[PDB]
Design a protein around this ligand. Structure first.
Ligand SMILES: CCCCCCCCCCCCCCCCCC(=O)OC[C@H](COP(=O)([O-])OCC(O)COP(=O)([O-])OC[C@@H](COC(=O)CCCCCCCCCCCCCCCCC)OC(=O)CCCCCCCCCCCCCCCCC)OC(=O)CCCCCCCCCCCCCCCCC
Ligand SMILES: CCCCCCCCCCCCCCCCCC(=O)OC[C@H](COP(=O)([O-])OCC(O)COP(=O)([O-])OC[C@@H](COC(=O)CCCCCCCCCCCCCCCCC)OC(=O)CCCCCCCCCCCCCCCCC)OC(=O)CCCCCCCCCCCCCCCCC
Ligand SMILES: CCCCCCCCCCCCCCCCCC(=O)OC[C@H](COP(=O)([O-])OCC(O)COP(=O)([O-])OC[C@@H](COC(=O)CCCCCCCCCCCCCCCCC)OC(=O)CCCCCCCCCCCCCCCCC)OC(=O)CCCCCCCCCCCCCCCCC
Ligand SMILES: CCCCCCCCCCCCCCCCCC(=O)O[C@@H](COC(=O)CCCCCCCCCCCCCCC)COP(=O)(O)OCC[N+](C)(C)C
Ligand SMILES: CCCCCCCCCCCCCCCCCC(=O)O[C@@H](COC(=O)CCCCCCCCCCCCCCC)COP(=O)(O)OCC[N+](C)(C)C
Ligand SMILES: CCCCCCCCCCCCCCCCCC(=O)O[C@@H](COC(=O)CCCCCCCCCCCCCCC)COP(=O)(O)OC[C@H](O)CO
Ligand SMILES: CCCCCCCCCCCCCCCCCCCC(=O)O[C@H](COC(=O)CCCCCCCCCCCCCC)COP(=O)(O)OCCN
Ligand SMILES: CCCCCCCCCCCCCCCCCCCC(=O)O[C@H](COC(=O)CCCCCCCCCCCCCC)COP(=O)(O)OCCN
Ligand SMILES: CCCCCCCCCCCCCCCCCC(=O)OC[C@H](COP(=O)(O)O)OC(=O)CCCCCCCCCCCCCCCCC
Lengths: 83, 157, 387, 218, 443, 108
């Protein structure tokens, strides 16, 4: 016995193709912007190490809850001709 | 059991017409149960046409970008887009094909040759430059006479 | 009197003689240069002082030179070793800047030079990105050194400007989120430079940190970023080069936990075990030993990686760094899954190892078989040894 | 030692509390001072001032996530959209500002609910953190399908509980922990007394919770 | 110690035998596990029962790894040395022989260690061996292997900083000085509870066992059920109760409710199982819950009764796994719907199945009866209701046991033929041990 | 009608023989497809869990309900044992500082 793949093959393969019909950007922009963000604004966290631990833990959970994943990322703005 | 026919290779033969990226038509013979990428490798196509299947535990499988007509769309095997195999196909579409993608774009290891593929015409699609490691890459130009079949091993490392 | 500086004059005279000998050997059409490599190793031994860290770097670079074959690559590695050695003795930001910049230029040129086949342009691309990202970090170092020099009037490394110099040092170790230059380098550059990049500069920079650095700040958020990003990235990336790049980011997060809680003895023990594992990893031809690297990088108990992780955990628990320790334990639980993926790939598979045809038959079985005996080092590791 | 009849350490206890163990010849702590912003941020007697002192840090997390999402959206913009600089600026600043305001709102709600339950119950314990987490997570989980209006209060309350246990209760319980010198309540074993606690140059996230644990600095 | 080095070096010589000599490979690997059984029997001969609690001590300097013998460790070591040659009779490759030889070295050294860091090093060095044993490529299950390895790693990683906390607190991990020093017992108690509540299957960290104990081969199932669960019990009896006793009193309502709900809910789940190996696999959780509550009662002779229940379980449940393994080996299924009338077709196998069914349900003339009576004496002496909960739920165990037996043994005769000489001699030492320990266990 | 042994012992494999040899797989069961499907489905039944009304209600009243009943019974038994042994109120986890561990040198 083997389980059946759910769905239709044409519809599943169109789902697999979606949002990838675009040339991928080079990674130099992401890396340069990350380095600029760290070298310019990471000193804002110097006093944060002394803040109460409930605040630090809730802030860490908030950063995890609002994080957007870089892999498999897509925007509807990539395929529209006006804002 | 009686006087019925001895099994021949011709009973299991599948013929596919393949148009390469120069527009030259080729006659490709395969066997039932063999994938399409294997028949393309054994025909003698160059190594610049092939690339690793980018899943976990399957990078030793070579794969190619093929264009499949609408009649044979339903004979490509089904992949769940939520599973890990679906994410493998999504990674391949994201990184290897990019803006060469069409509505007929598939991958040749997901086509298992049977009697329903007999007479099907496919075309080889273009791909973007890619790298797996230092001993397996593609600079972007299909200028090489080295066949994929002549490689003794497919190396993940 | 210059009688206390004969080792410096010996360094310069040896370079002057080695260039001329390499020129004379190439005028004969010699297609191999093992004599040049032996003279380079002799020069490495002759310029190194009698400290533990200096000789650890020296013996490491002598072993590394057996994977390099051209004259220019050997020259670039020697001039990178000069920066790596003299950074450990740097007591200012002048010498710090010059040693770091010499190392960066040597690495960039070697990445350009040694690429071959279809992966040439990918290696050149990743070298260009590394050079551009390195230039602005070097500018940040110079700018904040100028700020410190104006404020204090001297060359002391004190005050608020040391926070940016610390960020420069964290960039050079590939600490997340400034980690992506190393991730780019791992995907394209050949295995010998990857072996060089994961061992020697980390030793040089951590020895400078142990010897002459104090800051009034913390590195805890970069510990969290490195451990979580490295573990999740290595869990999610199917290419093996990216797996090992992200697992390296996780390991540098553990080394930063050892730095942050003081106690540099656990840092040095884990770094040594990691360097020996790296020497095994990038010189493997039999794929069954890839599983030994996996069980000794997952921290599994009887092998030496367990001991290197476990003194870091012990000293962190001693000074009560509870939250960073809990994050480290969670990421250690995550790391086991992809090291098991490694074991599934290369241990539960049929064995095939191709023979040599043009001589040099399995040329680094000595070093790989010697480094696999990290299962016998744990008897010495349990004692008070590294302190 | 080991018998099938009983377990002797289960009934061999001290009859009196012990005196304090002398660990070093010098019994004064050495440490760097805390900045005044964090000293003010610890005060809970004014619930509004507590929320005002704590919420900008929790808003910094949303700022970081919003800046990430804004750059990832900017990179995918086609040239016909990217060259329109006012529209591009308002789109990216909208993404960043929405993330920053949502994080600041969640942080202010958490800090105000925490200090309100603190002042209402008259004591400091783990109930105020659990109630504040339930309120904040219910604010996050509203309007979503249904595992989520229960799952998110549980996650925020669990973050509060982990914060109490790891950052507050365990350091308080181990204030008399010593790694050096005489073993505590076992001074007869004869372990020698050093002249001082050990000097460690630790980072700012690792600071001594008691004056006798170690001396921090250089 | 010198003997142990000689036994290890003799065992490791299986790899150097050329594979074309099949008879020699079989005989060498079988004798390599027969010899430690003789040595442990001799250690039982050498033991002075009116002497000290710890005998035959050896300590290896400043490397931790200190060893000693008490009664619980000695009985468990005897059981392991019995169980390993039976595992050798159920394997066919040198890879299997070497995995079980390394497992025997690690189990035997872990059972008698007196150092907490030594216990940590010796026990979970078997993790990768268990992963490869359970997730073997054609007939195993990688999901089960991932589950057992990840649960064990999670518990061990909780313990490791608390181990190092007491080590920095007093200066040693030796259990004789850890029990005599002042330590922060709540933290270390939580770490020790975290490891040993995963090793002993206690709810909620018990979901690895139904997958792993079924996906394993028959030899792996014999080892995992009869031996490796009891390392949690000997962890309780050797390390946690002597070193953190204040915690062990204060956690008693929580450990008590965990044991009660594990017993009841695992017994209720066993009734709806449709796989014979899953039926045998669930029943072990309730027995270990009774073991844990008897250990934690600390009331009359709690170490004695709990060790005796560990031995009775370690004798009876591997035999049930052996009978299920015979059925699977010669019928290629473990599914109840494919088996009926096994009394007419395997009379000897069905008789052995019935006797071990009665033993698993703690009927008299089996060591489980004496074990459960004495465990309930230890539980009763704290309170009568904690004993009543286990007493009134005896119908629920007998329901699944007799339902499984009656479904597979009676009815229309279909299924494989009766046992061979080899299968009978795999079963036979467990039966002799059961008859002795259930009729005249002591003198 | 196979012959797998010579007259003096000596097992023969019969690899090229016409007659079917009796061996280990001789009594392997013929698989019923629906039984295999049902056992496969019961093997993967965690994919069928859903937070509907009945699941939530039964997980509250039986699982959480009996867990709370067992915790209450355990605390009741602990307190009654301490009262019937001459002890004062004793400190369980989260119960303020009190007496734990009676002294053997003391008469209660
Ligand atoms: C100014 C100029 C603007 C420049 C902006 C630059 C942006 C460029 C883009 C970029 O960076 O790429 C993303 C890039 C992606 O990383 P990558 O190297 O490509 O890949 C690494 C990973 O593979 C990541 O892979 P991925 O991204 O593809 O996603 C895979 C995914 C896969 O995830 C998983 O599968 C794992 C998930 C595990 C559990 C799953 C949930 C299941 C639960 C069951 C359900 C029950 C309900 C429970 C509800 C929730 C409860 C948990 O992983 C995650 O989502 C987890 C990653 C999160 C990292 C967290 C580490 C942060 C510190 C640690 C503390 C907080 C951690 C949380 C824990 C605490 C909680 C109490 O991310 C980074 O490099 C991180 C840095 C970016 C963040 C900050 C940006 C800096 C800008 C600063 C703004 C201005 C200054 C203000 C701040 C002050 C200075 C700091
Ligand atoms: C004044 C300073 C004098 C020079 C000291 C530095 C130069 C060392 C270079 C060296 O030993 O050249 C290898 C060279 C052997 O190279 P080869 O036989 O031409 O190459 C064959 C292939 O490599 C294939 O053969 P293989 O891979 O099996 O052997 C490679 C080589 C070395 O292979 C390795 O690199 C792996 C050995 C790992 C041991 C590392 C020791 C570090 C331990 C730290 C303790 C503190 O083998 C040895 O172990 C030779 C050691 C001879 C004495 C070394 C002193 O050894 C010698 O000829 C003798 C050199 C000793 C002084 C003259
Ligand atoms: C934990 C894992 C998830 C929990 C399971 C809940 C779930 O997924 O149920 C789905 C399931 C949805 O059913 P359905 O098939 O979609 O159709 C039923 C409704 O017509 C569909 O309605 P709906 O649920 O989608 O939204 C409308 C809902 C309105 O409900 C809501 O909007 C949310 C429900 C409660 C708000 C959450 C606030 C805090 C709760 C978290 C506690 C954190 C602890 C912090 C310390 O109105 C109702 O259904 C009426 C019943 C609501 C009763 C609420 C009583 C809770 C207070 C407890 C008093 C004691 O919910 C039910 O079975 C119905 C009851 C409603 C929610 C459950 C309320 C009690 C259970 C909470 C247990 C958690 C405590 C753990 C300790
Ligand atoms: C915590 C006490 C240990 C009790 C554990 C339960 C043992 C299970 C079986 C009960 C047998 C009772 C045997 C009593 C006499 C034997 C010698 C003796 O005295 O026991 C030893 C230890 O006993 C053993 O090791 C018994 C071995 C039992 C294991 C049997 C199972 C293995 C056999 C498997 C089947 C083999 C069949 C092979 C034939 C084909 C020490 O225990 P204590 O008397 O409590 O020690 C005294 C304490 N102090 C020194 C501090 C004064
Ligand atoms: C082989 C050479 C390299 C071995 C390095 C091992 C590093 C750790 C890897 C993960 C742990 C695996 C341990 C399993 C041991 C038992 C076992 O199966 O042994 C092996 C051999 O294992 C050994 O190397 C045994 C000797 C080492 C241990 C004993 C001496 C030191 C103590 C038996 O041979 P096969 O499995 O048939 O070998 C075929 C190989 N392959 C799986 C790739 C198809
Ligand atoms: C790294 C190495 C591998 C892992 C560590 C293994 C450590 C050795 C095993 C445990 C050693 C102690 C054995 C138990 C014991 O009671 O031993 C005493 C009694 O000796 C024995 O009878 C030992 C019997 C050994 C076998 C019994 C099982 C124990 C562990 C088995 C290991 C080998 C199993 C092989 C399986 C294939 C000690 O005798 P001694 O004369 O050295 O000590 C007396 C005095 O203090 C002087 O020092
Ligand atoms: C056999 C190996 C395979 C062959 C291949 C060889 C590979 C090349 C050579 C090894 C490369 C790795 C070495 C990494 C560096 C570790 C040593 C750094 C120095 C260190 O730990 O500190 C000293 C302790 O030395 C010590 O004694 C440290 C002990 C050893 C640490 C390494 C542990 C893993 C092995 C203390 O310095 P001090 O107190 O004297 O300094 C005061 C004056 N500044
Ligand atoms: C180690 C591995 C196994 C761990 C298992 C999970 C343990 C969860 C609880 C950990 C300790 C929590 C803190 C205990 C003390 C505490 O503050 O809470 C008490 C109640 O908690 C309690 O003790 C009641 C909750 C615990 C009940 C039993 C554990 C539930 C989890 C497993 C259930 C599996 C069921 C399967 C369906 C307070 O008492 P109060 O305030 O309520 O008293 C009313 C009078 N003040
Ligand atoms: C397993 C099931 C076994 C039980 C089967 C049937 C037994 C029915 C027993 C019914 C009565 C039990 C005893 C209650 C009355 C006696 C009373 O003693 O005092 C209580 C007991 C004794 O009080 P004291 O003697 O005055 O200290 O009170 C307590 O201290 C406990 C009060 C809180 C109890 C509930 C706590 C919440 C736990 C939630 C668990 C759910 C987790 C879900 C995770 C999934």
């Amino acid at each position: 016995y083997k389980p059946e793949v759910p769905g239709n093959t044409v519809d599943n393969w169109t789902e697999l193709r979606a949002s990838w019909n675009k040339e991928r950007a080079s990674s130099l922009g992401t890396n340069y912007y990350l380095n600029v963000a760290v070298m310019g604004f990471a000193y804002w966290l110097n006093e944060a190490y002394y803040f109460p631990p409930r605040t630090l833990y809730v802030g860490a959970l908030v950063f995890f809850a609002l994080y957007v994943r870089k892999a498999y990322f897509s925007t509807p703005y990539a395929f529209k001709h006006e804002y | 059991h009686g006087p019925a026919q001895t099994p021949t290779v011709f009973d299991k033969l599948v013929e596919v017409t393949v148009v390469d990226m120069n527009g030259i038509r080729h006659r490709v013979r395969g066997l039932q149960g063999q994938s399409l990428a294997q028949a393309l490798v054994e025909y003698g196509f160059p190594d610049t046409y092939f690339f690793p299947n980018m899943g976990f535990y399957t990078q030793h499988i070579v794969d190619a970008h093929v264009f499949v007509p609408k009649e044979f769309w339903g004979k490509v095997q089904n992949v769940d887009p939520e599973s890990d195999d679906g994410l493998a196909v999504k990674r391949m579409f994201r990184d290897i094909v990019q803006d060469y993608q069409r509505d007929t774009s598939f991958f040749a290891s997901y086509i298992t040759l049977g009697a329903e593929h007999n007479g099907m015409t496919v075309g080889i699609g273009p791909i973007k430059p890619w790298i797996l490691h230092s001993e397996w890459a593609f600079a972007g130009v299909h200028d090489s006479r080295n066949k994929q079949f002549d490689k003794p091993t497919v190396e993940i490392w | 009197a210059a009688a206390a500086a004969m080792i410096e004059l010996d360094l310069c005279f040896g370079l002057l003689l080695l260039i001329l000998f390499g020129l004379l050997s190439l005028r004969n059409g010699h297609v191999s240069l093992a004599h040049i490599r032996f003279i380079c190793q002799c020069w490495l031994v002759m310029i190194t002082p009698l400290e533990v860290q200096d000789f650890a770097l020296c013996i490491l670079t002598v072993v590394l030179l057996q994977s390099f074959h051209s004259f220019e690559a050997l020259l670039f590695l020697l001039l990178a070793y000069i920066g790596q050695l003299y950074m450990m003795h740097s007591c200012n930001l002048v010498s710090f800047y010059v040693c770091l910049e010499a190392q960066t230029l040597c690495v960039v040129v070697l990445c350009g030079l040694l690429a071959r086949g279809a992966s040439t342009s990918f290696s050149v691309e990743a070298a260009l990105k590394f050079l551009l990202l390195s230039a602005m970090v070097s500018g940040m170092a110079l700018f904040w050194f100028s700020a410190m020099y104006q404020r204090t009037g001297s060359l002391d490394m004190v005050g608020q400007e040391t926070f940016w110099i610390l960020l420069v040092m964290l960039f050079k170790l590939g600490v997340a989120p400034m980690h992506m230059w190393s991730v780019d380098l791992y995907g394209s550059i050949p295995k010998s430079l990857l072996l060089y990049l994961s061992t020697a500069p980390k030793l040089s920079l951590f020895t400078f940190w142990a010897s002459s650095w104090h800051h009034d700040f913390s590195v805890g958020v970069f510990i969290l970023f490195s451990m979580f990003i490295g573990s999740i990235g290595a869990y999610g990336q199917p290419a093996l080069r990216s797996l090992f790049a992200y697992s390296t980011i996780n390991e540098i997060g553990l080394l930063l936990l050892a730095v942050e809680t003081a106690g540099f003895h656990t840092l040095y023990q884990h770094l040594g075990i990691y360097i020996i594992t790296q020497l095994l990893l990038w010189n493997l031809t039999d794929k069954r030993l890839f599983a030994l690297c996996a069980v000794s990088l997952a921290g599994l108990p009887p092998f030496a990686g367990f001991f290197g992780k476990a003194w870091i955990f012990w000293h962190a628990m001693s000074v009560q760094a509870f939250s960073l320790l809990a994050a480290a334990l969670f990421c250690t639980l995550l790391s086991l899954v992809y090291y098991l993926r490694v074991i599934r790939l290369f241990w539960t598979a049929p064995v095939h190892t191709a023979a040599s045809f043009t001589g040099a038959p399995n040329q680094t079985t000595l070093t790989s078989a010697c480094a696999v005996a990290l299962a016998f080092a744990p008897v010495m590791l349990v004692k008070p040894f590294v302190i | 030692v080991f018998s099938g009849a009983f377990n002797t350490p289960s009934s061999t206890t001290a009859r009196e509390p012990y005196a304090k163990t002398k660990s070093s010849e010098a019994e004064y702590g050495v440490d760097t001072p805390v900045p005044a912003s964090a000293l003010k941020a610890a005060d809970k007697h004014d619930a509004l001032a507590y929320a005002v002192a704590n919420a900008p840090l929790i808003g910094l997390a949303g700022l970081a996530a919003g800046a990430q999402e804004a750059y990832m959206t900017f990179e995918r913009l086609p040239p016909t959209l990217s060259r329109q600089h006012f529209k591009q600026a308002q789109l990216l600043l909208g993404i960043i500002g929405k993330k920053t305001a949502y994080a600041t709102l969640l942080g202010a709600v958490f800090s105000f609910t925490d200090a309100t339950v603190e002042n209402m119950r008259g004591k400091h314990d783990m109930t105020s953190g659990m109630v504040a987490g339930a309120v904040t997570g219910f604010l996050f989980g509203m309007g979503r399908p249904m595992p989520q209006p229960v799952a998110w209060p549980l996650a925020f309350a669990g973050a509060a509980v982990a914060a109490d246990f790891i950052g507050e209760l365990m350091p308080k319980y181990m204030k008399d922990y010593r790694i050096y010198g005489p073993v505590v309540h076992r001074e007869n074993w004869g372990d020698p007394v050093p002249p001082r606690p050990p000097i460690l140059d630790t980072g700012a996230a690792v600071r001594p919770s008691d004056p006798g644990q170690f001396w921090r600095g250089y | 110690m010198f003997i142990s080095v000689l036994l290890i070096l003799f065992a490791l010589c299986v790899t150097l035998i050329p594979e074309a000599h099949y008879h020699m490979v079989r005989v060498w690997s079988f004798v390599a596990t027969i010899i430690p059984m003789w040595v442990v029997t001799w250690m039982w001969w050498n033991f002075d029962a009116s002497g000290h609690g710890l005998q035959m001590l050896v300590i290896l300097g400043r490397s931790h790894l200190a060893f000693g013998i008490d009664g619980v460790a000695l009985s468990l070591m005897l059981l392991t040395t019995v169980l390993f040659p039976i595992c050798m009779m159920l394997l066919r490759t040198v890879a299997g022989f070497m995995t079980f030889i390394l497992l025997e070295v690690l189990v035997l050294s872990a059972l008698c260690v007196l150092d907490l860091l030594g216990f940590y090093i010796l026990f979970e060095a078997s993790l990768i061996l268990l992963f490869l044993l359970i997730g073997r490529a054609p007939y195993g299950s990688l999901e089960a292997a991932y589950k057992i390895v990840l649960y064990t790693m999670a518990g061990s990683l909780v313990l490791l900083p608390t181990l190092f906390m007491i080590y920095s607190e007093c200066g040693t991990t030796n259990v004789l000085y850890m029990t005599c020093a002042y330590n922060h017992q709540t933290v270390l108690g939580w770490g020790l509870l975290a490891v040993l509540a995963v090793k002993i299957p206690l709810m909620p960290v018990h979901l690895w066992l139904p997958e792993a104990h079924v996906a394993a081969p028959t030899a792996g199932s014999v080892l995992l059920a009869g031996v490796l669960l009891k390392l949690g019990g000997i962890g309780f009896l050797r390390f946690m109760l002597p070193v953190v006793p204040e915690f062990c009193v204060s956690v008693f309502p929580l450990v008590s409710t965990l044991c009660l709900v594990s017993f009841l809910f695992s017994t209720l789940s066993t009734l709806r199982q449709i796989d014979l190996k899953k039926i045998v696999a669930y029943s072990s959780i309730a027995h270990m819950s009774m073991v844990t509550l008897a250990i934690f009662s600390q009331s009359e002779f709690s170490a004695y009764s709990s060790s005796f229940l560990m031995i009775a379980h370690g004798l009876i449940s591997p035999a049930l796994f052996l009978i299920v393994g015979i059925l699977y080996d010669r019928a290629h299924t473990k599914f109840i719907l494919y088996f009926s009338g096994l009394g007419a077709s395997m009379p000897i196998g069905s008789t052995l199945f019935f006797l071990f069914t009665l033993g698993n349900l703690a009927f008299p003339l089996f060591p489980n009866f004496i074990a459960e009576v004495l465990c309930m004496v230890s539980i009763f002496a704290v309170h009568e209701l904690l004993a009543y909960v286990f007493c009134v739920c005896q119908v629920l165990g007998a329901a699944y046991g007799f339902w499984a037996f009656n479904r597979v043994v009676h009815g229309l005769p279909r299924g494989p033929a009766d046992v061979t000489r080899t299968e009978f001699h795999t079963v036979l030492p467990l039966l002799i041990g059961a008859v002795w320990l259930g009729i005249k266990p002591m003198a | 009608e196979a012959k797998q042994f010579t007259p003096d012992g000596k097992y023969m494999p019969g690899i090229f023989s016409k007659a079917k040899p009796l061996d280990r797989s001789t009594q392997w069961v013929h698989k019923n497809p629906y039984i295999e499907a049902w056992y496969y489905r019961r093997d993967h039944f965690e994919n069928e869990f859903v937070w509907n009304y009945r699941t939530t209600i039964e997980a509250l009243w039986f699982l959480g309900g009996f867990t709370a009943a067992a915790y209450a019974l355990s605390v009741f038994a602990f307190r009654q044992a301490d009262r019937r042994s001459g002890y004062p109120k004793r400190q369980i986890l989260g119960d303020e500082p009190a007496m734990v561990l009676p002294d053997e040198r003391q008469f209660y």
